[PDB]
Design an enzyme around this catalytic site. Structure first.
Site, PDB file in Angstrom:
ATOM      1  N   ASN B  94       0.749  -1.064  -0.060  1.00 49.16           N
ATOM      2  CA  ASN B  94       0.660  -0.070  -0.183  1.00 49.16           C
ATOM      3  C   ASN B  94       0.785   1.025  -0.051  1.00 49.16           C
ATOM      4  OD1 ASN B  94      -0.826   2.603   2.257  1.00 49.16           O
ATOM      5  ND2 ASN B  94      -2.824   1.657   0.587  1.00 49.16           N
ATOM      6  N   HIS B  95       1.920   1.014   0.420  1.00 48.42           N
ATOM      7  CA  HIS B  95       3.310   2.456   0.763  1.00 48.42           C
ATOM      8  C   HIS B  95       2.911   2.555  -1.050  1.00 48.42           C
ATOM      9  CE1 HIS B  95       5.545  -1.324  -0.044  1.00 48.42           C
ATOM     10  NE2 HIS B  95       6.580  -0.328  -0.482  1.00 48.42           N
ATOM     11  N   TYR B 158       5.717   8.361 -11.072  1.00 48.49           N
ATOM     12  CA  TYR B 158       4.291   7.649 -10.095  1.00 48.49           C
ATOM     13  C   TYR B 158       3.723   6.207 -11.469  1.00 48.49           C
ATOM     14  CZ  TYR B 158       0.180   6.878  -7.493  1.00 48.49           C
ATOM     15  OH  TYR B 158      -0.758   6.572  -7.586  1.00 48.49           O
TER      16      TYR B 158
HETATM   17  N1  LIG Z   1      -5.364   8.756  -2.416  1.00 52.21           N
HETATM   18  C1  LIG Z   1      -5.323   8.220  -3.292  1.00 52.21           C
HETATM   19  O1  LIG Z   1      -6.126   9.723  -4.151  1.00 52.21           O
HETATM   20  C2  LIG Z   1      -5.230   7.315  -4.269  1.00 52.21           C
HETATM   21  C3  LIG Z   1      -5.354   7.333  -5.235  1.00 52.21           C
HETATM   22  C4  LIG Z   1      -5.188   5.906  -6.991  1.00 52.21           C
HETATM   23  C5  LIG Z   1      -4.308   5.249  -5.959  1.00 52.21           C
HETATM   24  N2  LIG Z   1      -3.691   5.068  -4.805  1.00 52.21           N
HETATM   25  C6  LIG Z   1      -2.496   4.617  -4.115  1.00 52.21           C
HETATM   26  O2  LIG Z   1      -2.504   3.897  -2.593  1.00 52.21           O
HETATM   27  C7  LIG Z   1      -1.843   3.735  -2.496  1.00 52.21           C
HETATM   28  C8  LIG Z   1      -2.312   4.561  -0.759  1.00 52.21           C
HETATM   29  O3  LIG Z   1      -2.565   5.855  -0.836  1.00 52.21           O
HETATM   30  P1  LIG Z   1      -2.229   7.407   0.540  1.00 52.21           P
HETATM   31  O4  LIG Z   1      -3.440   8.648  -0.637  1.00 52.21           O
HETATM   32  O5  LIG Z   1      -2.811   6.676   1.438  1.00 52.21           O
HETATM   33  O6  LIG Z   1      -1.009   7.695   0.153  1.00 52.21           O
HETATM   34  P2  LIG Z   1      -0.675   8.473   1.679  1.00 52.21           P
HETATM   35  O7  LIG Z   1      -1.533   8.797   2.099  1.00 52.21           O
HETATM   36  O8  LIG Z   1       0.366   9.461   0.433  1.00 52.21           O
HETATM   37  O9  LIG Z   1       0.104   7.297   2.461  1.00 52.21           O
HETATM   38  C9  LIG Z   1       1.469   6.850   2.094  1.00 52.21           C
HETATM   39  C10 LIG Z   1       2.174   5.817   3.100  1.00 52.21           C
HETATM   40  O10 LIG Z   1       3.214   4.957   2.908  1.00 52.21           O
HETATM   41  C11 LIG Z   1       4.189   5.692   3.400  1.00 52.21           C
HETATM   42  N3  LIG Z   1       5.218   5.368   2.641  1.00 52.21           N
HETATM   43  C12 LIG Z   1       5.425   6.944   1.932  1.00 52.21           C
HETATM   44  N4  LIG Z   1       7.124   6.270   1.942  1.00 52.21           N
HETATM   45  C13 LIG Z   1       7.794   5.365   2.325  1.00 52.21           C
HETATM   46  C14 LIG Z   1       8.709   4.630   2.425  1.00 52.21           C
HETATM   47  N5  LIG Z   1       9.961   5.567   1.538  1.00 52.21           N
HETATM   48  N6  LIG Z   1       9.249   3.615   3.670  1.00 52.21           N
HETATM   49  C15 LIG Z   1       7.939   3.032   3.955  1.00 52.21           C
HETATM   50  N7  LIG Z   1       6.461   3.860   3.822  1.00 52.21           N
HETATM   51  C16 LIG Z   1       6.738   4.884   2.978  1.00 52.21           C
HETATM   52  C17 LIG Z   1       4.112   6.758   4.674  1.00 52.21           C
HETATM   53  O11 LIG Z   1       4.592   6.804   5.293  1.00 52.21           O
HETATM   54  P3  LIG Z   1       6.170   7.199   6.030  1.00 52.21           P
HETATM   55  O12 LIG Z   1       6.216   8.561   5.270  1.00 52.21           O
HETATM   56  O13 LIG Z   1       5.945   7.588   7.588  1.00 52.21           O
HETATM   57  O14 LIG Z   1       6.785   6.319   5.874  1.00 52.21           O
HETATM   58  C18 LIG Z   1       2.066   6.407   4.387  1.00 52.21           C
HETATM   59  O15 LIG Z   1       2.069   5.971   5.267  1.00 52.21           O
HETATM   60  C19 LIG Z   1      -0.675   4.061  -3.316  1.00 52.21           C
HETATM   61  O16 LIG Z   1      -0.181   2.734  -3.365  1.00 52.21           O
HETATM   62  C20 LIG Z   1      -0.932   4.615  -4.191  1.00 52.21           C
HETATM   63  O17 LIG Z   1      -0.458   4.498  -5.351  1.00 52.21           O
HETATM   64  C21 LIG Z   1      -3.815   6.245  -4.442  1.00 52.21           C
END
Ligand SMILES: NC(=O)c1ccc[n+]([C@@H]2O[C@H](COP(=O)([O-])OP(=O)(O)OC[C@H]3O[C@@H](n4cnc5c(N)ncnc54)[C@H](OP(=O)(O)O)[C@@H]3O)[C@@H](O)[C@H]2O)c1
Ligand SMILES: NC(=O)c1ccc[n+]([C@@H]2O[C@H](COP(=O)([O-])OP(=O)(O)OC[C@H]3O[C@@H](n4cnc5c(N)ncnc54)[C@H](OP(=O)(O)O)[C@@H]3O)[C@@H](O)[C@H]2O)c1
Ligand SMILES: CCN(CC)C(=O)Cc1cccc(NS(=O)(=O)c2cccc(Cl)c2C)n1
Lengths: 263, 263
Positions: B94-95, B158
């Site tokens: 998920n990260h 990305y």
């Molecule tokens: N939200 C959306 O609109 C959306 C739309 C389409 C797809 N997605 C997808 O959904 C997934 C989650 O989206 P999101 O909005 O939830 O993410 P977010 O709020 O940006 O969550 C990102 C998470 O990943 C971690 N992370 C970032 N870099 C890291 C690293 N190098 N090592 C370990 N952890 C890391 C962060 O914690 P730390 O900084 O503490 O490590 C954070 O917990 C992603 O794969 C993304 O492509 C999201």
């Protein structure tokens, strides 16, 4: 519609040119009166090609040799090559890391190396070449595979890298349209093609027909020269419409009206 | 037809868990009574996810903090968490690294990092997780996007990395169907979700609306537990049929047969 003279005097990089598709790309460009810099790891084989290229009408024909696992070599290479030719019209990205067709078993170092060789280098080469492509208003041919639009059992590492190519470069197409950047980007989608490395790799594993290396090369040139978004040479007239995803075209169009363009 | 008891005392990894969709996944597995191991970089924001899943019904809840840019850490991570829970059922990936929204104009570093974090790591964690999941007949959720199926301007590095996931994990799946490996791989294609990060980054640029985190997480859980190939959560009912690609589907099958399986 295509004429040979759309290449006469044009300056051109062919990669993976030491054999197969890439080798023939170079030959035809040379029947067209193009200047080329061709590249690959195996020096002998590269001299053998420059020479035949000159023997068939190229304006110039140089080779540079190195592993594209090497990003500095990719950077540097682009610069020597432009300098040799006074610049650059078209970048043919044609090489790939050799893979056997087996079930995947945990080989991470293979996923990684195949990602470097078939995706990272394409982007660096592209990024090194971009200034001269911009000044020239030129073109980049991104050679890929049906396995870059669908998936076959036995080549997960390969296909990941080819899928990434569509995703990266297609986004680059779309930014360039919006910014009125007139560097075209032709993603080339190849069904099986009768190169030795691909006869050797599929005998007794894949049974489908194989199309000819010489035309495949040509068609790559053609669709790149015409500034086609895409160029499918997969051995059929119907099958491109089953690989090219209208769903995605529709979606990309609509989605674009959902940006605040002014901003 | 799903039910929450299917996760009762299941051992699940959740990455990207310190906020966002991934926190909300953890929180939901807790209400259902799973053993959870959550990772992210940030130790403080993980201590907060664990107390909360504890106060919710988690059979058990642990953290490991670490950067998924480091592949030794991804690898050791999966063994640390397997020792703790005494096995592994579901691995949720998920990260991601979000980058600068911007036109692409040379930033290879990003293109390298995005691929490390977003793709390579999903591979290493998966290979490390594989024996525990062959032994549970468990599940992987690979979490991706719309922009892993179609391209969007301002985000090429990305997109490349989400697309790669499609080509690698979709190949690996079809290899599992063949070898009757009883591990399911669920690709999650999600449109915009209202996590602060997505909205803050898109504030002013992309005008389309964003579905909730909470049920995005739930749908993820549900389609991974029902061992589905894909799971769409994209803001409308019709959009999955434009992204999920009947052309590809049809070729994936018809080509199963041009192979020599005896060998
Ligand atoms: N939200 C959306 O609109 C959306 C739309 C389409 C797809 N997605 C997808 O959904 C997934 C989650 O989206 P999101 O909005 O939830 O993410 P977010 O709020 O940006 O969550 C990102 C998470 O990943 C971690 N992370 C970032 N870099 C890291 C690293 N190098 N090592 C370990 N952890 C890391 C962060 O914690 P730390 O900084 O503490 O490590 C954070 O917990 C992603 O794969 C993304 O492509 C999201
Ligand atoms: N053949 C097919 O059926 C088929 C189908 C779909 C797509 N394609 C694609 O078309 C392109 C060319 O295919 P092909 O059949 O012509 O391959 P091929 O005949 O084996 O030739 C590949 C050429 O690329 C080069 N290359 C390999 N490793 C390299 C490296 N580390 N650095 C620089 N160059 C390297 C090789 O030269 P050196 O070994 O001397 O370095 C050789 O010049 C590839 O992009 C491939 O994915 C082929
Ligand atoms: C597969 C990597 N490789 C050497 C093994 C290359 O020469 C590239 C290559 C060879 C053969 C086919 C191919 N792409 S492809 O046409 O989509 C493909 C890939 C796997 C199987 C089949 Cl039948 C087909 C047609 N790419």
């Amino acid at each position: 519609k295509f004429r040979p003279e759309m290449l006469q005097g044009k300056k051109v990089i062919v990669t993976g040119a030491s054999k197969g598709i890439g080798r023939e790309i170079a030959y035809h460009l040379a029947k067209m009166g193009a200047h080329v810099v061709v590249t690959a790891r195996s020096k002998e084989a590269l001299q053998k090609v420059v020479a035949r290229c000159l023997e068939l009408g190229a304006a110039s024909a140089h080779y540079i040799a190195g592993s594209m696992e090497d990003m500095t070599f990719a950077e540097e290479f682009v610069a020597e090559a432009g300098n040799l030719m006074g610049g650059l019209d078209m970048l043919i990205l044609n090489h790939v890391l050799y893979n056997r067709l087996t079930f995947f078993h945990g080989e991470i170092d293979n996923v990684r190396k195949s990602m470097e060789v078939n995706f990272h280098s394409f982007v660096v080469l592209s990024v090194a070449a971009m200034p001269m492509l911009m000044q020239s208003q030129g073109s980049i041919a991104v050679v890929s595979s049906v396995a870059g639009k669908i998936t076959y059992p036995l080549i997960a590492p390969y296909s990941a890298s080819k899928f990434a190519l569509d995703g990266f470069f297609s986004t680059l197409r779309s930014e360039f349209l919006v910014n009125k950047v007139n560097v075209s980007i032709t993603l080339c989608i190849l069904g099986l093609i009768d190169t030795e490395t691909a006869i050797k790799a599929t005998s007794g594993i894949y049974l489908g027909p194989a199309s000819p290396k010489e035309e495949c090369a040509l068609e790559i040139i053609k669709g790149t020269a015409l500034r086609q978004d895409e160029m499918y040479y997969v051995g059929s007239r119907w099958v491109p419409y089953l690989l090219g995803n209208p769903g995605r075209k529709i979606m990309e169009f609509l989605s674009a009206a959902e940006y605040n363009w002014d901003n």
